[PDB]
Amino acid sequence: DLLGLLRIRIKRGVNLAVRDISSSDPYVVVKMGKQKLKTRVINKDVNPEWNEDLTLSVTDSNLTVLLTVYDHDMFSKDDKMGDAEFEISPYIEALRMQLDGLPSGTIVTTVKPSRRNCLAEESRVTWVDGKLVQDLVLRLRHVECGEVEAQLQWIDLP
Template sequence: MDNIMGLLKVRVKRGINLVVRDVMSSDPYVTVSMGNQKLKTCVIKKNCNPEWNEELTLSVTDPSLPVKLTVYDKDIFTKDDQMGDAEIDIRPYLECLEMGLENLPTPTTIRRFYPSKDNCLADESAVVWQNGKITQELIVRLRNVETGEVELQLYWIDLRDSK
């Protein structure tokens, strides 16, 4: 436990235009993993635009490891079908935390990120100082699938100084 830098709170908000994997719809859930940690949301029945609004917490020991997001369709009698995946590099977000910007007016946009071939962003993303914390809102485009996006929010809890 001594090598944990902090906790990354990942709020999985919603899925957007997810693929159909069953006859008429899908029963999607999301797994969020980093290193050997793997967490998952609840299953939303028969919905290709689900709203999870669930917060999952990862312990971060190595910020160079990506956060991996995978969407699955829950099946009862067969293996769950994959509905796409994405990776999030948290290092740019953590760089904003290191700036020591706690005395800014709220809300203040600290940095913006744009979709590129090097990330899974579907739209512009901003790191924002608001109400005493730095968060990042993002929409990721799922890979290895015809269509689908997932909206997320990141929030960091630093454990390095709390000993």
């Protein structure tokens, strides 16, 4: 049933919540359907630069991705550091586009911050270097501070 694979590049966290004394040990957990993926832990850093790829199998245009940040405590429970979700459908519908041969830098669809989504700023779906890309800044919900910067890429699966 597979449509393809979505690469979620988790770039970094910005000003993440402090869940130890003075810092945190954040890792990101991403869920979609029954799939559950996580980045590595970055030690003692509220602006962790993960630059890390998570790969999800996609069977559905109508699916939502959930992202949760936790602070790893080796010898105890891990505290919540906020969560956000986002839609992939706009990305997916832009893939089915007749896109090929547009100038690099070309902005194709734009998703706007709403009371209902987690975007800290409008999300540009861009056609660069022969690939369709979506960049996101997600404002974490349920926490006193924190943002996560991610980028979507698509992998065809023959």
